[PDB]
Amino acid sequence: HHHHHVINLKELKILHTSDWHLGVTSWTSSRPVDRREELKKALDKVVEEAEKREVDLILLTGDLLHSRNNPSVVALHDLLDYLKRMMRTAPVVVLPGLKLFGNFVTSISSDITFVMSFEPVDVEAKRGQKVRILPFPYPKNEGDFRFFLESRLNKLYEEALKKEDFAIFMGHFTVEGLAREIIINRALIPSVVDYAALGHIHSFREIQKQPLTIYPGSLIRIDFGEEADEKGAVFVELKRGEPPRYERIDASPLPLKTLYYKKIDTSALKSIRDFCRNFPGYVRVVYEEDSGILPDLMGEIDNLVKIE
Numbered sequence: 001h002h003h004h005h006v007i008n009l010k011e012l013k014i015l016h017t018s019d020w021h022l023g024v025t026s027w028t029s030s031r032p033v034d035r036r037e038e039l040k041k042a043l044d045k046v047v048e049e050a051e052k053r054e055v056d057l058i059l060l061t062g063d064l065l066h067s068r069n070n071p072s073v074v075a076l077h078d079l080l081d082y083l084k085r086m087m088r089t090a091p092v093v094v095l096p097g098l099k100l101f102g103n104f105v106t107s108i109s110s111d112i113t114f115v116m117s118f119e120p121v122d123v124e125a126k127r128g129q130k131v132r133i134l135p136f137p138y139p140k141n142e143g144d145f146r147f148f149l150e151s152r153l154n155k156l157y158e159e160a161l162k163k164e165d166f167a168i169f170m171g172h173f174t175v176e177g178l179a180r181e182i183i184i185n186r187a188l189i190p191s192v193v194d195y196a197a198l199g200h201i202h203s204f205r206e207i208q209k210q211p212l213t214i215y216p217g218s219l220i221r222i223d224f225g226e227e228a229d230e231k232g233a234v235f236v237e238l239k240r241g242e243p244p245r246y247e248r249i250d251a252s253p254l255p256l257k258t259l260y261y262k263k264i265d266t267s268a269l270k271s272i273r274d275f276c277r278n279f280p281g282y283v284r285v286v287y288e289e290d291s292g293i294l295p296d297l298m299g300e301i302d303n304l305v306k307i308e
Contacts, residue, residue, distance in 0.1 A: 001088070003110070005128040010240040012129050012166050013055045015090070015249075017046050017233035018199035019062035019097075019218040020082075023075030026223060026282075031298060031305040033282065035220055036078070042219035042251035043082050046233045049249045050089045053235055056125040058086050061170055061216075062199025063097035087111040090126045095135050095170040097200060115170065118152050120159040130164040134193060136171035138182060150188060157190035166238055169196040175207050175215075189213055194238050204230040204248065212236070212244045219251040224284045224306070227256040255281035263291040264307075276301045284308075 020043065024035045050058060064079055065071045071079075086092050091111045096102070102114030113123050115135040123131050134156040141148060160167045169190055173182035178201065186207050189196050196213035203226065204217035216234045221227065233249040257279060261268040264287050276283050284306040285297075298304050 003091075003124055003126055003128055009127055009129060010165075012057065012125060012131065012194075012238040013053060014057050014059060014168075014195065014197075014236040014238070015046070015050045015053070015055045015233060016059040016061070016195075016197045016214065016216055016236060017219070017249075018060065018197075018216045019202055020064045020079075021066040021218060021220070021222060022064060022078045023071050024066035024220075024222060027305045030308065033305055035222075036074070038254055039220050040078065042231070042253050045251055046219065046249060047082065047085050047089070049233070049235070050086065054126075055090045055235070056127055056129060057123070057131060058090050058092045059168070059170060059197045060092060060094045060199075061097075061172060061197055062201075064094075065097075083112065091123060093121075093123055093131075093133055093168075093170070095137055095172060095197075095199070097138070097172055118155070120156070122164075129166060132160065132163040132167045134160050134167060134169045134190060136169065136173065136184075138172050149182070149184065153184075153188045153190065157192065160190050160192045165240075166195075167193045169193040169211065169213075171196070171198050172200050173198070174200065175205075175213075178205070186213060195236055195244060202226055202229070204232065204234075212246065214246065220253045221256045221281075224256055224258050227258060255279070256284070257281065258284045258286055261285065261287045263287065263289050264294060265291060269295065269297075272297065272304070273301065276303045279303060 026033045065075055093113045095115050099116050102116055106113050115121055121133045125131050173184045176183050176185045193211045196211045198215045201215040202218040205215045207213040214234055217231055219231055231253045232251040234246055235249055236246045238244050283304045
């Protein structure tokens with residue numbers, strides 16, 4: 001199953017997913033929970049939607065592995081497993097959050113490209129579309145730093161002007177003013193790209209519409225700051241005549257809940273027990289004062305991962 005070659009094809013379907021954090025175990029200081037099974041389920045749903053929609057290109061951004069430096073064999077084997085699966089559907093371009101194995105794999109394949117530098121790369125998509133990738137990976141400096149970054153973005157704008165069909169910006173950074181980190185103003189994302197695929201933020205954000213610029217988010221709620229979050233992937237469709245459209249692919253991951261109390265008194269105990277009873281995800285209790293020896297709530301309630 002190799003690529004198609006359709007004359008005058010003026011469209012491109014993209015799956016963009018990000019920030020998988022393969023290998024994460026949560027709440028290791030209170031109650032370790034291995035998130036793999038939930039994550040593999042979320043990823044499977046993303047793989048199946050990609051197949052279902054017959055996408056042309058899959059973009060992966062952000063931290064696909066939880067461990068900055070020392071991913072486990074399982075985490076690595078899961079990554080390569082899902083990479084392979086995706087490459088069966090459509091070509092995969094990865095902007096990382098080893099340089100050796102990435103460069104080698106890109107050489108020997110026509111369906112995975114690791115963009116490991118600031119240099120543009122042209123890729124071929126599932127139906128023969130030509131796509132120019134403008135990458136902005138994580139890069140000592142201080143305010144010359146800002147001028148460095150800005151110089152790099154300017155170069156990518158010029159290289160984007162040299163596109164044949166589609167141009168796609170990929171970046172691993174924090175958009176200034178979100179509501180060491182690399183902080184970059186959204187106005188400096190080259191305006192002449194058709195899509196800007198961003199990663200590193202766990203939460204789905206539509207940053208702007210022109211160029212359409214999106215963080216898809218993580219696929220699980222990694223910690224309690226993510227309880228109100230949208231988790232999933234994004235499906236983007238590009239057509240030469242027209243504005244880009246996109247649909248969120250929800251990963252439907254386990255819900256999180258933080259229950260708050262001054263003291264864990266009689267009423268707070270009943271509140272906690274009732275709530276967790278049939279709650280299908282994980283619960284945190286936040287309280288302020290000790291008032292006696294606390295009952296063994298974690299032995300009693302398997303969903304409760306943190307009192308603290």
